[PDB]
Write the structure tokens for this entry.
Amino acid sequence: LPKPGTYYLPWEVSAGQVPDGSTLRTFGRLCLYDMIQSRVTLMAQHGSDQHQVLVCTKLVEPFHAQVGSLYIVLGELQHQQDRGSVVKARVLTCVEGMNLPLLEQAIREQRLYKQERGGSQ
Amino acid sequence: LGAFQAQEKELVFDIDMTDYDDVRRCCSSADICPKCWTLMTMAIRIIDRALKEDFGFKHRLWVYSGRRGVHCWVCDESVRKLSSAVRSGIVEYLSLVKGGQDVKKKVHLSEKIHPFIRKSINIIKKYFEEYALVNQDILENKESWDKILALVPETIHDELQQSFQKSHNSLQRWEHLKKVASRYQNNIKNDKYGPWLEWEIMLQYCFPRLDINVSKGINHLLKSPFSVHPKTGRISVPIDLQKVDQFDPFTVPTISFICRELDAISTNEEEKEENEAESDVKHRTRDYKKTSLAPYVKVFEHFLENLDKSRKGELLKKSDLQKDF
Amino acid sequence: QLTDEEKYRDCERFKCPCPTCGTENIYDNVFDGSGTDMEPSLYRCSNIDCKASPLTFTVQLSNKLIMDIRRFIKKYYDGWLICEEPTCRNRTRHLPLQFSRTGPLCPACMKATLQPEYSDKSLYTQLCFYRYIFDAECALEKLTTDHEKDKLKKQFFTPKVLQDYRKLKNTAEQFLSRSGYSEVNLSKLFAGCAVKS
Amino acid sequence: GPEPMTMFLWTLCTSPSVLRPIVLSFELERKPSKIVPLEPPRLQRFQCGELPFLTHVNPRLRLSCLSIRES
Amino acid sequence: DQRNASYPHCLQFYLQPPSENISLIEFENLAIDRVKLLKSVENLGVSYVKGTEQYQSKLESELRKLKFSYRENLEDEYEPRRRDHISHFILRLAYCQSEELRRWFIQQEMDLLRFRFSILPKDKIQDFLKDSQLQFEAISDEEKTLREQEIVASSPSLSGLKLGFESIYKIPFADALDLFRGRKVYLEDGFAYVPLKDIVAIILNEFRAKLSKALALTARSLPAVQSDERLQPLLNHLSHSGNVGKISLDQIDLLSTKSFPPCMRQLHKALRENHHLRHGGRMQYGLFLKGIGLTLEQALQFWKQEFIKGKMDPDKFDKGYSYNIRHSFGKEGKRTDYTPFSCLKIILSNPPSQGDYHGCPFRHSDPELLKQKLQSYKISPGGISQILDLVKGTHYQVACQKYFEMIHNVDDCGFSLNHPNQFFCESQRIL
Amino acid sequence: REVLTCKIEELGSELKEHYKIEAFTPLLAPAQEPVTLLGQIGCDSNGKLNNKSVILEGDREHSSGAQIPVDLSELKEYSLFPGQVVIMEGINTTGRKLVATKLYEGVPLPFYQPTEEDADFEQSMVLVACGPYTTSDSITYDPLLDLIAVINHDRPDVCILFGPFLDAKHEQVENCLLTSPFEDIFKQCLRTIIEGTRSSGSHLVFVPSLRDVHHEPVYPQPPFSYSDLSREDKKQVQFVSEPCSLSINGVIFGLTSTDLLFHLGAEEISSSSGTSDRFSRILKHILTQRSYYPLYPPQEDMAIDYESFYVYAQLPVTPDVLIIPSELRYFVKDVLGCVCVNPGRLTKGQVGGTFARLYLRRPAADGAERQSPCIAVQVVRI
Amino acid sequence: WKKLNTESVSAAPSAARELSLTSQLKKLQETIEQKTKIEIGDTIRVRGSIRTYREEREIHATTYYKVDDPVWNIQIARMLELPTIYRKVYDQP
DNA sequence: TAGGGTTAGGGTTAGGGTTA
């Protein structure tokens, strides 16, 4: 059995605020599909800032690509020497039309409740 | 499903001692004798020399299975990435004894001889004579040469049978066979047979036999070293490359003997090593130092040091190429 | 594989009124009738008493065909879409800007998608059907009985009639040349490979 | 509690084609004007780990349907 | 100068996907034409032998008939070269579904390339290599003379020290597998010293196979985006498109004496004699009995009986043998049900060794033992001679057909033999 | 979707750069503090647009095709049409209902700067004419011949005639009563025009229209094809695509054979506190929208190829002169330094319409303020 | 658990009403079969009790079915609704 | 003399440790 997948907004993982080898699930919008090297570069906006996450895909071929669309990625993170941070994909589904603010508020509320229950112990 | 595939594994070969029953006569079925150990000894020499010279593989590690077999563990770098077809080609090139149960003659050699066959026959003469003629005595009984003559054309079957009847020991019969073969080579007259009757019979009764199935697969499994056979308790140990001729199978330490050795080691520790606040690592280190496995682990460590030196050389070469000093 | 009936089952048959007798003319095949009635459709008019040869109205036929083709293309570029929900059946022309895993989302039911009211396949099938009735060479080739084919060709079909049929087919084929549905761009297909261009 | 139609309904009633999350608008079955307090707790023998045990239980609520919609 | 730049030579490794635009009908025509040509060349290769004159002449006739590029007249080669290029990449897009399909495509393309290179002049092969992105190395006459004896005793079809006026290339071992396997090239510390013609042909073949394999692997991930409604019927068209009733457990002996083909009669006889068999025969026999209408329970009883006759312990049987048999039929475990081995696969399977009996006797048996076993089956001397001639001609399937006709007393079998299930079902139909 | 979102995002980015907007809030974000949202103007109702049926549609890069109703009750003045790119600031309390609080205005592209060679040209004569050149039911082409005589007598430097050269609305072509092929008829008409203009010896410019018969009706469309032009007449006869941006002597001409004004007037709603010219508002809207046909969805009487429209039908720069044939009342108006002419149809029913004549005098570019080279225009009734 | 679909029902050539009913039965059967097919990367809903086996916890399933949520509405609603359920019912004396 | 019928109803259990 594997470890569970905790949610993480793109900008935190972009800054490397998670330990190496952790399992995380995040979101973003695809920007490029490097065919030969099996690499995916998705992007997510934050005000005037744009953040990039590198996704290895060696475990989900065959895989259709939808340029300029949202995605959900779940897997493990490995801190490479030069490439930086890349997530090893285990499941990679596509969702469209789902509004970000509801999701962001949802994880914020869940984190708040978890911390509140953590105040008794 | 389908994305979980084997990627690399070490190339291995297996040698089964029991696959020589129709040729050997020293023992029966699953029995062994010190006289027949020369078989796997010369097989080891042949295979190791062929690998070291023809292909140039650097690192090799020979392990005695425990009962009747010896395994090869090639662990070089540029070999772990090979596909299945290349390994099949390796095994095909290293195999000469070909045929099933129905086939009698295992060799069909033309006039031309490969350099590999030439090297094998040159390095096989010094061992064939003593072992074959004296120890096993292939040409001893009547049925012995009766099955021998099936390996040669019928044109001289009666003459050779009469010569064997006249002769007394296997040495005289072998000499007469050599003389008859040499006479026939000078008198070759429309014969499909090769000009190396003596060579082909020695290879047929003397060459090792492999199995393509254990090396063709990439996800296959094979016994790890330092195992414990559940029948004789002999621990699988590495075999030194430079002392192969001094390897008696019956002298390998067993699990019961090594356990009694551990008991005696504790007895010595009752008056030699006391009041030690060390972790289990150092205690177990001195434990297996005091045992009978010390030469075997020493050989394993020497091989590991050789591999480490090879890694140092390869990383220094990479540094030279990458201009990083 | 599929016959002409299956190929053009849902296509509109060409219609044109006779300039003189005022009777509308219907055309579905190169020839009129079959068997012992083996006559051209454009050989004689619809009315029994009408002696006018429809071949005399080549210009009128072409001028009606161009109008019909313009009508089909105008209908195709209407951009009408229909909701896929059985209880909605919405009709609209405002194509939204939010898609899903399959395509546009219906801005009414918020659960189903939108499909074109008149796809390119129907348009191409209609154009092929128009080209179908003006290929006398293919019809002659399809004639299994060689003797009857020769008899029909010699008894009535002068080469001038074939030239007129080619002239009619020319206008239909004119719009077929610029049709993109029968043109495949190879650059898109293999753009993924980049090792050696 | 205590013909192709039979098998058809048996198949339909025990499939996820019907067992779906629904939004219910329900009216209490026992009319509020009615008054009849006569309910002491009962007792039954629910068992899970191959070991029966006895426990009291409240009477089951009774309702009535006004409108049912999907979700 | 698009025409000349696109197509400089009649041969091409097919490394540059095109960029022009084609009509759909022409697309379909090219696809069907090249698949027909590939099937025809496969059949011609499997019927005759390589080289000769009739086989190559028929292949050239097929190429000329199907309006492809086969010769090298220096005029008007634009159209055939373009058609070959387009159709080859179309089939590259097509045959990327299963590993076996990829292997078949690679083998047939290899055959076609070998033919075209075999009709290529030497100056032209040198120019074609120059245009290719390949590097070769030439050793010096010093070591050429130093290693004369090994290079002449390797016998690469060499005729008594003909190395005069020759250039010897040095190649890593992992690229010359064809000559590597047959023991026809001297070897030294992972290197090969080789003559000119055979090794250049084989090296080109092997590198082409590797590069085509890599490109097919790359293209495997494309059909995920091939959702176009058009071309779907064509892809479906190119995508390609033994249940006899239950039998008893005691009629097997009579059916074996009647219905077992030679490729398995020896295995049955050995099983009935020694009551014990090794892996290679065991899986083959189990698959065959599964494929002719034997249930799980019947097969379990049969195996337990025939192994009790082998002096075992029933507990040991349950632990090992029935345990293996359960997954042999896909009862539990991964349960991937296995189809029986084909005649071609069995003939080209792992060569049996001592203590093994699997494999058709027409390929892995002595001629004298084969004749004796045929005589044990009461085969006519004329039939024996015909079987021997067929064996000499390496036509094992025709020999099996003759054996079937002799045992069943039918003048003509009328069906081509490809699988033992076919043999058994036809025998049951006769019965 | 790609074309629409690319155009929307480009114009939004340009407006953000122009008006110094710090950031854009996502459409569905609920916040009490007023925020600025970027989106396209559309009408939810299938019928004509109205102030009670306005919805804002977002963009892919920010809200992935959002749709929110717009409340203009607090709005003071408004003038909107479907497919209008605007930047609007409001309050979104629950994320579903938005109340408008502000409304921006478009920004025109910079004027083209004439070079040294442009100022050298002193003057030229250019005439504008448009179809249909037939009466309600007569194909005698009397207005065509009279216009030919007028242009031959006047001998303008440049002669420009708009389409259609053969309207399909005629009853003769409706019932297919013609004895000649349409292509042959148009070839004969072009021969007639060339032979008539030979005496004048003036430059002929032909712009196709969407009502043409022999030409395929998808906007934009390729120019007419003629292979019988003589060597001498080749230097003065040309065909350009519709729409075209023809620059003569450093003066940019806005050319279109489509009726923007009629459509826009029929499909625009406004409520202004003061009286103003609706046509001027439409002209400034189309100048600011940076699109020849900014209306979306288009008029149910023509076909638009969106890819070709985006790649070929974008305004290069602000044109000095704009030519808009229309079915509405003839007028001449100038907005933001751009001259716009509405000569109207030359034939109205069975009576002649109006045609206009233009002047192009290059003024001194010494002054800082750019001045329109066109100095005078007169519309002569026919 | 794999419910045993033993003794598959065989239809009879009855009147048209029974033919239509058998067609609807086949449609229902194929709908159930399609609904119950599960692959890696889908959304599953499980109902049942708790059992401990081999010193680990499992969930026996009384019923289960695949959920089609191509937009992630139902999961967002669930994981927004649950904390209210806790705070209103579960975290009470 | 004012509600219909009022009825209590499903409430078990199923087995890892596997390859061509």
Remarks:
- Helices of chain A lie at 10-14, 100-117.
- Chain A has one domain: 1-117.
